[PDB]
C-alpha cells in the first residue's frame, strides 16, 4: 500500500496571545511546527504502515526552512520525503496550493491513500484536503477520528453535530484527519537516519506544473488586509474562600444579584 | 487558466439549505438573516437552496425567513448529506442559474461540501467568517479569523465566481419568520446522477429521544480532567437539569474515558455561546477556548488559581469541584423552586 501524508510548517499558533490590556499580538514562545493536524496525519500513516506494510511518503510544499518538517517525518519512520519549494507557489490561496499538491501526487503517481490534516492551524481553513480529492477526482471522507484498512477499503469514523458515523471507500482515496494518537517519539537513531537522507527539492519547472495555476496567479483568493482583533479584557470576581459553602453562598448571591440566574 | 472565471452576467447571493430530519439547520436562518442585508446592498435576490428527499413545507419557511427563490433539487438519494451527491446537485445548479456568491454555514459537513464545489468549479473559497459586507456591484468583502483566533483577515474573490465562503454559526442573526413574504420556487432537475463513492455503515444520533444536546442548550456545564473520575460527571448532569442545561466536557476529559466524544467542547469539538459556561476542573487550553469564549457568561470552578479559564471568567471559585458542584447545585434549585 502506498501512503502520501501532505505535511504543512506552520507558526505555533497556540502559542500566539492577544493582550487584553494592550490589544497587541504577542509571540512569545512561537516557532515553527509540524502543523498538529499532519502531526496526526503522519501517526495515522505509520501505525498502517505498522499494521499492514506501506509505503509512506510525506510531501510539503514551502520554503527551504521547511526542510525541518520533512526531516522530522522520516525521524519517526517515514520511508520518503520531498520538498517542493519556488517561489512560484508563494502567495497561494487555497485552490493555488491543492493545485500545486494534485498535481505533484499525479506527477510521481497517485498512491493508494492521501492523509491530510483536518485544517493547518494558521490559515484555519480546512480546505486543501477536501480541494486535492476533486483536483484528483478521488472519494474523501474529512475530520477521521479514526482510520482503518479492509482490504481494498478504507473505514473512516467521522461525526458531524448530529450523528455519529462511520464511511468506507474505495482506494485510491482521500482522509482528512480531526485525531490519532500523539506523533511518535523520534529516538537519536531515527534523528540521525533522517539526517542522512536524501531528500529530493522540486520547482514548477521540474515538476511541469503551469505557473498560471499556482501561486497567486492561481489564487481567486486574495488577503486584502490583516489585523489584530480587539479583545475586551473581562474583570472576574473570583471567590476563594476555605469553606467551600461560603464561597458557592457568594457566588450564587452574585450571580442572582446580577441577573445571570433567575426563577 | 480561465476556469471559473467571471461572465459579468451572475446574479444573486445563495444560502445552501442543510438540514437534518427535512428541517433547516438553525445556521441557514442565520445565513438568510445576514444575507438578505447583503441582497438588499446589492439589488440582487437572495436564494436558498435545497438539496433532498423530500422538500415537505420547507421552502414556504425559507421564504418566509428572508429567500427571494427557492431551488429545489429532490431525489432518494439526497436523504443524508454525501459529498458526492450534494457537490453534484449544486454545482449543476450553479452552472445553470450563475449565481454571483454562494455562502454556506461552516458546520461539519458544510466545511466538507464548501471546498468541493469550490474546486470543482474552481473558484474562490473564505472560510468560516464572521463578518461579511457588499459593494453596491455584489462583491462580497470575506473578513475571518485566522492563526487560532489572533488574526483577522479581510479578502475578496474579484474575478472568479461564484464568490463562496463559509460562515461560522451563531454569529448572525436570523430573521423573525414573515408571513407576509412571497417568493419563487423553482424545480430543478438532475441531469447526471452519480454513485456515491463513499458508504455509510454506521449513522447513530448522538442524543436521544427528547434529551438536550450540547449545540443548544442554554446552560453548558462542563467537565475536564479535575473532575477526577467519570463517576463525578453526575455532579454536572445534576447542575445541568437544576437549570434545564447540558453536560460538555474538555478533550481530555474524552481521553480520560469520562465522556463521549460527542459532548467535547473545542476547536476540534463543538463551539457552543450558552448564557452560562460552567468550565469545572478544565484548565483553559487554547483549544478548549476556541470552542467556548464566546459563551455570555462563563463561570470557573478550578482548584487553580492561575488556571488560564480564570483569564476570561467573569465569576468562578478557587476550590474543589466536588465539593463545591453539589453545594452549587442545591443552593440554585432552592433560589428556582422557590
Ligand atoms: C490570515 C490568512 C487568511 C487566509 N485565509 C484564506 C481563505 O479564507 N481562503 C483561502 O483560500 N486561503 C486563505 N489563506 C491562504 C492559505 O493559508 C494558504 O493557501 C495555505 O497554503 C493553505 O490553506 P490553510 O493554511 O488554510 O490550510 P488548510 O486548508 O487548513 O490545510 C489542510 C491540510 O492541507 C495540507 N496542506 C496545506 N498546506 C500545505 C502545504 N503547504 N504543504 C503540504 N500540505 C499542505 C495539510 O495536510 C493540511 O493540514 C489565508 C492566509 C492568511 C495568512
Ligand atoms: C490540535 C489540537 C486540538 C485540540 N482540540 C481540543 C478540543 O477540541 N477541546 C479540548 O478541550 N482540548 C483540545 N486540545 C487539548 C488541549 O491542548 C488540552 O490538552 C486540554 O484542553 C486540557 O483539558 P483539561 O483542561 O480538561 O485538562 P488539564 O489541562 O489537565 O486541566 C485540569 C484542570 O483541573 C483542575 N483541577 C484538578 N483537580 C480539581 C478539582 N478537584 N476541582 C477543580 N479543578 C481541579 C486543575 O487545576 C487544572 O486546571 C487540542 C490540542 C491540540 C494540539
Ligand atoms: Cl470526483
Keep these: 500500500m502506498n501512503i502520501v501524508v501532505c505535511v504543512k510548517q506552520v507558526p505555533d499558533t497556540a502559542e500566539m496571545k492577544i493582550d487584553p490590556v494592550t490589544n497587541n499580538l504577542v509571540r512569545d514562545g512561537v516557532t515553527n511546527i509540524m502543523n498538529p493536524y499532519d502531526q496526526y496525519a503522519l501517526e495515522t500513516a505509520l501505525q498502517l504502515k505498522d499494521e499492514l506494510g506501506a509505503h509512506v511518503t510525506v510531501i510539503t510544499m514551502g520554503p527551504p526552512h521547511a526542510e525541518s518538517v520533512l526531516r522530522d517525518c522520516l525521524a519517526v519512520g517515514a520511508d520518503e520525503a520531498k520538498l517542493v519549494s519556488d517561489r512560484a507557489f508563494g502567495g497561494a490561496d487555497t485552490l493555488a496550493t491543492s493545485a500545486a499538491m494534485a498535481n505533484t501526487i499525479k506527477h510521481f503517481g497517485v498512491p493508494d491513500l492521501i492523509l491530510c490534516g483536518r485544517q493547518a492551524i494558521d490559515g484555519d481553513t480546512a480546505q486543501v484536503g477536501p480541494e486535492i480529492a476533486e483536483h484528483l477526482g478521488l472519494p474523501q471522507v474529512t475530520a477521521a477520528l479514526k482510520v482503518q484498512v479492509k482490504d481494498d477499503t478504507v473505514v473512516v469514523d467521522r461525526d458531524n453535530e448530529q450523528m455519529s458515523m462511520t464511511f468506507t471507500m474505495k482506494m485510491p482515496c482521500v482522509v482528512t484527519v480531526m485525531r490519532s494518537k500523539d506523533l511518535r517519539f523520534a529516538s537519536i537513531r531515527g534523528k540521525m537516519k533522517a539526517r542522512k537522507a536524501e531528500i529530493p527539492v522540486y520547482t514548477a519547472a521540474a515538476l511541469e506544473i503551469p505557473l498560471d495555476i499556482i501561486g497567486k496567479a492561481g489564487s481567486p483568493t486574495q488577503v486584502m488586509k490583516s489585523f489584530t482583533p480587539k479583545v475586551t479584557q473581562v474583570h472576574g470576581e473570583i471567590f476563594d474562600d476555605e469553606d467551600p459553602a461560603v464561597a458557592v453562598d457568594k457566588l450564587v448571591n452574585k450571580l442572582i444579584e446580577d441577573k445571570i440566574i433567575t426563577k | ?338
Excluded at chain 2, 157 to 167: A, F, L, N, S, Y
Excluded at chain 2, 256 to 278: A, L
Excluded at chain 2, 279 to 295: E, Y
Aim: hydrophobic share 35%.
Design chain 2, 1 to 338: 487558466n480561465t476556469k471559473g472565471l467571471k461572465t459579468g452576467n451572475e446574479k444573486d447571493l445563495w444560502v445552501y439549505v442543510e438540514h437534518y430530519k427535512g428541517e433547516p439547520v438553525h445556521v441557514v436562518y442565520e445565513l438568510l438573516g445576514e444575507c438578505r442585508k447583503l441582497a438588499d446592498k446589492c439589488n440582487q435576490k437572495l436564494a436558498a437552496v435545497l438539496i433532498t428527499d423530500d422538500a415537505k413545507d420547507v421552502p414556504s419557511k425559507l421564504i418566509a425567513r428572508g429567500a427571494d427563490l427557492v431551488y429545489v433539487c429532490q431525489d432518494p438519494a439526497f436523504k443524508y448529506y454525501s459529498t458526492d451527491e450534494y457537490t453534484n446537485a449544486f454545482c449543476e445548479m450553479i452552472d445553470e442559474y450563475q449565481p454571483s456568491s454562494v455562502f454556506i454555514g461552516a458546520t461539519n459537513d458544510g466545511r466538507d461540501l464548501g471546498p468541493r464545489i469550490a474546486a470543482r468549479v474552481n473558484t474562490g473559497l473564505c472560510a468560516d467568517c464572521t463578518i461579511l459586507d457588499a459593494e453596491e456591484d455584489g462583491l462580497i468583502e470575506w473578513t475571518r479569523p485566522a492563526a487560532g483566533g489572533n488574526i483577522m483577515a479581510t479578502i475578496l474573490c474579484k474575478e472568479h465566481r461564484p464568490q463562496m465562503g463559509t460562515v461560522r454559526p451563531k454569529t448572525f442573526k436570523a430573521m423573525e419568520p414573515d408571513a407576509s413574504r412571497t417568493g419563487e420556487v423553482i424545480n430543478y432537475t438532475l441531469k447526471n446522477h452519480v454513485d456515491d463513492r463513499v458508504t455509510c455503515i454506521r449513522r447513530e444520533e448522538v442524543v436521544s429521544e427528547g434529551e438536550m444536546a450540547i449545540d443548544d442548550a442554554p446552560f453548558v456545564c462542563s467537565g475536564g480532567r479535575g473532575m477526577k473520575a467519570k463517576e463525578n460527571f453526575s455532579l454536572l448532569y445534576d447542575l445541568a437539569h437544576a437549570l434545564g442545561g447540558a453536560v460538555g466536557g474538555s478533550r481530555a476529559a474524552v481521553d480520560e474515558g469520562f465522556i463521549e466524544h460527542p459532548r467535547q467542547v473545542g476547536q476540534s469539538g463543538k463551539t457552543v455561546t450558552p448564557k452560562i459556561y460552567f468550565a469545572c476542573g478544565i484548565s483553559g487550553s487554547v483549544q478548549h477556548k476556541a470552542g467556548m469564549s464566546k459563551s455570555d457568561t462563563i463561570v470557573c470552578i478550578n482548584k487553580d488559581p492561575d488556571a488560564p479559564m480564570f483569564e476570561i471568567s467573569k465569576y468562578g471559585i478557587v476550590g474543589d469541584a466536588l465539593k463545591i458542584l453539589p453545594l452549587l447545585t442545591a443552593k440554585i434549585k432552592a433560589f428556582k423552586e422557590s
